Amino acid sequence: HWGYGKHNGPEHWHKDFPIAKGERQSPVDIDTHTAKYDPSLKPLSVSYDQATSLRILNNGHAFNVEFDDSQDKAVLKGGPLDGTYRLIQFHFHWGSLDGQGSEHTVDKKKYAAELHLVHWNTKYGDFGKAVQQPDGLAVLGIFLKVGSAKPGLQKVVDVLDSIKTKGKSADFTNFDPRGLLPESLDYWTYPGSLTTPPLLECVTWIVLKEPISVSSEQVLKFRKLNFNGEGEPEELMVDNWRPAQPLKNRQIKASFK
Numbered sequence: 168h169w170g171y172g173k174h175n176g177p178e179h180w181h182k183d184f185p186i187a188k189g190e191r192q193s194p195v196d197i198d199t200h201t202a203k204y205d206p207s208l209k210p211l212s213v214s215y216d217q218a219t220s221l222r223i224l225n226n227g228h229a230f231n232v233e234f235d236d237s238q239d240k241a242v243l244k245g246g247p248l249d250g251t252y253r254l255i256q257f258h259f260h261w262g263s264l265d266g267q268g269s270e271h272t273v274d275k276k277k278y279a280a281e282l283h284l285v286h287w288n289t290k291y292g293d294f295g296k297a298v299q300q301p302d303g304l305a306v307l308g309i310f311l312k313v314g315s316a317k318p319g320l321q322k323v324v325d326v327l328d329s330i331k332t333k334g335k336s337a338d339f340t341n342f343d344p345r346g347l348l349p350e351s352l353d354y355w356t357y358p359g360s361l362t363t364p365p366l367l368e369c370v371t372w373i374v375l376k377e378p379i380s381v382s383s384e385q386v387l388k389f390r391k392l393n394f395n396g397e398g399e400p401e402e403l404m405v406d407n408w409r410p411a412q413p414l415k416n417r418q419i420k421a422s423f424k
């Protein structure tokens with residue numbers, strides 16, 4: 168019964184998922200002055216030309232856009248990664264106000280939302296096996312700030328009305344995720360976890376330095392979604408973000424000076 172409420176929120180998760188108090192939990196605050204520039208880090212290789220989106224679903228916590236990951240169609244390579252990682256889904260995290268919504272923070276600064284592009288290491292055969300490994304997933308995090316509209320995001324925004332409640336899904340084909348990327352691919356990277364239960368510590372996080380801009384109207388439509396299922400009391404899907412966790416024995420590395 169976990170969620171983002173006062174009676175089932177992040178502060179409570181540890182009761183069902185003890186790893187919540189683990190050594191490599193996410194998200195975290197990225198202190199730009201203590202981050203270490205690593206010249207050995209290679210540029211990111213994002214190959215989304217052949218991406219095949221299939222649907223969009225409201226899972227009661229966020230909305231996910233799912234892709235066909237039965238072959239190497241949309242993959243992430245390079246950067247701090249060893250091997251090929253396939254894109255399986257993307258989702259966002261957002262707030263009830265423009266001043267909050269992101270999971271990671273930069274020098275304590277919070278963004279309006281955060282986009283997560285989830286990929287799994289193909290050496291493990293399937294997603295379920297990948298999450299059990301320390302190098303099983305790679306999540307690309309992109310911050311969203313409110314300003315000018317993002318044309319490439321409008322297609323997602325327009326279909327939200329069709330998946331307002333938990334459990335609803337809609338066909339969502341031919342969506343090109345390349346339209347959601349910023350101009351630069353400079354990033355920070357650190358070993359972490361999933362930010363929602365089971366909170367497994369199987370993620371190599373890659374957080375882009377350059378945020379993308381979205382309009383107030385676009386983010387407002389995110390806030391119209393529901394955590395609840397149809398026929399149940401309406402609870403607006405807002406503030407579905409986990410606060411920063413202690414860095415502990417970890418070092419954040421930057422690909423840029």
Ligand SMILES: CC(=O)Nc1nnc(S(N)(=O)=O)s1
Pocket residue numbers: 256283285306360361362363364
């Ligand atoms: C099936 C799946 O993708 N689960 C995830 N759980 N948490 C994720 S996150 N918030 O770290 O990107 S992805």
Ligand SMILES: [Zn+2]
Pocket residue numbers: 258259260283362
């Ligand atoms: Zn996420």
